[PDB]
């Protein structure tokens, strides 16, 4: 019995188990409860911390994933797959998992927080792309991920209800987070350095720790990759949530508590089957259920509170990939595939606009046709495409990232910007869709140190490169090298300069503007547009 | 007669004339000022449309300028050359029909190709005698037979009472007519050809230019046509009936007066009462709109300009079209506060939006607020240098190189062949500061050839260049197409088209071929901004 794989946190023993990477041991602890299963009359509702257990608890195998909706668009495809639930679903899955070197840190280590992303539908903690023994093991990084409520069961809300109260998702996370606050001195870890970060729907996620005062206590630095709380898809009115909430009861055969009741009587997969037929419009990068604005985590929509916070002892590094929307495209918009080369015509196009944009008027759709046609070459199917691609990332990811940066800048937080931009040699996408969304995470987490995996060597020197800024960043709040001359530096992104770096091959090289023109357009003109039909 | 001199005597429709041997850098030219084509359009026949001119006896002198037509002068900058070279340089008047004649000396022996120049002038002023205007180098150097006319500005030549008999609107581009016919008819005994006739003008002469192509009973009285600088069109060259007939009616309150015993008022009123107060009657604060221009009086312009060259059909017509680099620095300079041509014209976000409201007068608070988003640089919203080059751009934009490129394309696609050009060469001898770039107006030297007169002071180059545009100028007469067809070593210039909307730049380099007409900008004037109207408050 190896004593370096034996823990004692507050709730009992663990033992974990120890794990080869590349160059060395990594103590790992897998499927650790944070919470009392959310099951039965529990769904829906705010987590219960885990009770105490007798004996010594097995933490060497990753736990259920959340009960979610799995896609088959693609079937046995690894590029949608990957993203695919990999252990049983159930809804008893609040567990997370802790990566330490072996052996276990002598001194207090950063920790850094995973929480992953998927729509706020979907994603486990227990993906390869999430793999935490690289960070682990080279960079010497306490790494924490955890499973948290998707779907109906983490985000359908009955607002002011006592028994749907909405935001349980993010309760299970803030749950994760006091736990790690609670325990990780334990395994070596600094519960005074904490680094929460996440990409997409756990950007998001991210995000709102950092809008909601209660989370603020139990961490020091957020990374925001891919995602944000503001924008078009990450929260819902309270209003549009009970609409949602009713559709689906309505759906499913079902005042509050005797609503919420019958709920509670289905079988999951009953839920999930319908949890999709409740959106206002045929969306894409839209999602059913959500964080919603329900005044008690989050006080006011998150403009409302990006406009007004104060962020001064704030570190942020938030990032954009390259292609974001291309992603999305094969996923509802007709004439765009994997297999051939989505080329549109100018029709297409402006069908794929009131898609991606699901919400926008006549006025505004062909305000957004106008903005991104290439007059040049206007019925140029390749340049249709493209551009069909940057409004779906522009409205979602890229632009919201804008104001985000921008909005903590100003309010006196410390915020680093990059956008990512190497396509990965072994990506089982077409070219044409570039570097699509989430496809940096695996280059962050270190997996091209894995030989057998089949990356270039050039980019397990990238990827070396990236787990050195996301640490240091842990670290310190800054992701420059601390001594280290020559890089040239990484700048703080500020409204003044508007700088940001690219994330490549090549070296660090400073950009200034996240697509400023562009991004003024959908932050500035088009909300002016509406708010006037 | 009988001393004088052969060569300088014609006989027109009219009488007889005898003209004057001018001296051109490279020889002589014979040139023929002042012949009247209209009767005077004065008393009664003032609003009215003009009645040709009744013959008279003996032989008419026609070696000076005539008049200028009643119109404004602009004292903004007191003296200085770059607006006292507009100004009228012969006595106001409203006797003031008259055209001018430059011919080869002595006269052609085969049927030469005509050049018709038409004044800008905002539509209330202009001369055809102005220094700028001079073909007598045109004439000598090409061989050229050109012909000018003076046409009535202001409220002479465009207050209206649409529908009304006695002030029907729009006799200023009859004026203009008349005289195209009077080219028909006499132009041969000059040595010019009837069958072989360009029109061409700047500014509102451009806009003038471009409402004879759409207007039919003018259609016979030309071939080809060159709009630099302006076209039908766009915000400013044309008013609906509606508004021509409130400006109208204003006006007469304002000098203080049903439709027939109004104008009879406004007949009695001296004529500078009425420049006086021309400029009252518009509607907002703005620069680029003016007072009293055609208007669409379902006549002369049967629709609208946007609805006639978005039908029509053009397979019979050639037509050269262009701006210069900076075609709106000159507006700023008149009338947005923060300008002048006197210091650098740096300004503030806060002067830029303010000057958004004037550049764009019709704008509803959100077209404004999408023009300022589209011309803000994002990057560097407050500052000074990009915002004062920005405010250059809404104006220039707005006025002429949108409406010319939507001009551009509508015709091409209609069947007509298009040249288009941008003019980027500022002239060694501007009085204008370097902020304002290559302005509005200041081509036309070059294409007359002005340089070629060693006095003016002009470089070499510059004299080269002067050259190089007036053959394509003159061969585009000739032939409909600028392109030399001798020397075709040279770079060749394109037909501008709806796929690949070629255009070339005219500088001290040779021809350089570009694509789109500010593309994605012009985008934005020609079909966003009409649909984000879609408000009801302004007018
Ligand atoms: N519950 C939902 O809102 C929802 C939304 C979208 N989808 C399907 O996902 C399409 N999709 C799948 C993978 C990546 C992006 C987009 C299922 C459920
Ligand atoms: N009566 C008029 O329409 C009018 C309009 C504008 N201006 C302005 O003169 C300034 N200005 C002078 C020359 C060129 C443009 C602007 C005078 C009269
Ligand atoms: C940069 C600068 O000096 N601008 C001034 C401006 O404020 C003033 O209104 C104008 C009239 O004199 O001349 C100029
Ligand atoms: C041009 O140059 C001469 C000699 O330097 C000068 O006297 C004259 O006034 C100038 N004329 C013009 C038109 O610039």
Not at 265 to 287: C, G, K, N
Not at 354 to 378: C, F, K, M, N
Request: glycine share 8%; charged share 20%.
């Amino acid at each position: 019995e190896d004593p370096q794989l034996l823990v004692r946190v507050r709730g009992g023993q663990l033992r974990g188990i120890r794990l080869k990477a590349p160059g060395g041991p990594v103590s790992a602890f897998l499927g650790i409860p944070f919470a009392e299963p959310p099951v039965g009359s529990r769904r829906f509702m705010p987590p219960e911390p885990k009770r105490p257990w007798s004996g010594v608890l097995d933490a060497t195998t990753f736990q259920n994933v959340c009960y979610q909706y799995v896609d088959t668009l693609y079937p046995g495809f690894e590029g949608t797959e990957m993203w695919n639930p990999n252990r049983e679903l159930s809804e008893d899955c609040l567990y997370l998992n802790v990566w330490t070197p072996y052996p276990r840190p002598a001194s207090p280590t950063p920790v850094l927080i995973w929480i992953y992303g998927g729509g706020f539908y979907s994603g486990a903690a227990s993906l390869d792309v999430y793999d935490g023994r690289f960070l682990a093991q080279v960079e010497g990084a306490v790494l924490v991920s955890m499973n948290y409520r998707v779907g109906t069961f983490g985000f359908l809300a009955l607002p002011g209800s006592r028994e749907a109260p909405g935001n349980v998702g993010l309760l299970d996370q803030r749950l994760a987070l006091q736990w790690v606050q609670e325990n990780i001195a334990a395994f070596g870890g600094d519960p005074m350095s904490v680094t929460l970060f996440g990409e997409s729907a756990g950007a998001a996620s991210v995000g709102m720790h950092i809008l909601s005062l209660p989370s603020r206590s139990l961490f020091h630095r957020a990374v925001l990759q891919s995602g944000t709380p503001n924008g078009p898809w990450a929260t819902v009115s309270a209003g549009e949530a009970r609409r949602r909430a009713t559709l689906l009861a309505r759906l499913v055969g079902c005042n509050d508590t005797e609503l919420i009741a019958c709920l509670r009587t289905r079988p999951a997969q009953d839920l999930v089957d319908h949890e999709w037929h409740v959106l206002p419009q045929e969306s894409i990068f839209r999602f059913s259920f959500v964080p919603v604005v329900d005044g008690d985590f989050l006080s006011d929509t998150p403009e409302a509170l990006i406009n007004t916070g104060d962020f001064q002892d704030l570190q942020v590094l938030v990032g954009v990939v390259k292609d974001e929307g291309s992603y999305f495209l094969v996923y509802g918009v007709p004439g765009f595939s994997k297999d051939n080369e989505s080329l549109i015509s100018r029709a297409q196009f402006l069908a794929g606009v009131r898609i991606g944009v699901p919400q926008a008027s006549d006025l505004a759709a062909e305000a957004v046709v106008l903005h991104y046609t290439d007059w040049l070459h206007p019925e140029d199917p390749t340049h249709l495409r493209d551009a069909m691609s940057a409004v779906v990332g522009d409205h979602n990811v890229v632009c919201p990232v804008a104001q985000l940066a921008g909005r903590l800048a100003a309010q006196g937080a410390r915020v680093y910007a990059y956008i990512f931009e190497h396509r990965a040699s072994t990506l089982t996408w077409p070219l044409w869709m570039g570097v699509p969304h989430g496809y940096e995470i695996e280059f962050i987490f270190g997996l091209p140190l894995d030989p057998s995996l089949n990356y270039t060597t050039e980019e397990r020197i990238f990827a070396q490169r990236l787990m050195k800024y996301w640490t240091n960043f842990a670290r310190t709040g800054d992701p420059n090298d601390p001594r280290d001359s020559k890089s040239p530096q990484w700048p703080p992104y500020t409204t003044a300069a508007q700088q940001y770096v690219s994330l490549n091959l090549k070296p660090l090289e400073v950009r200034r503007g996240l697509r400023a023109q562009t991004c003024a357009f959908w932050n500035r003109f088009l909300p002016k547009l509406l708010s006037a039909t």
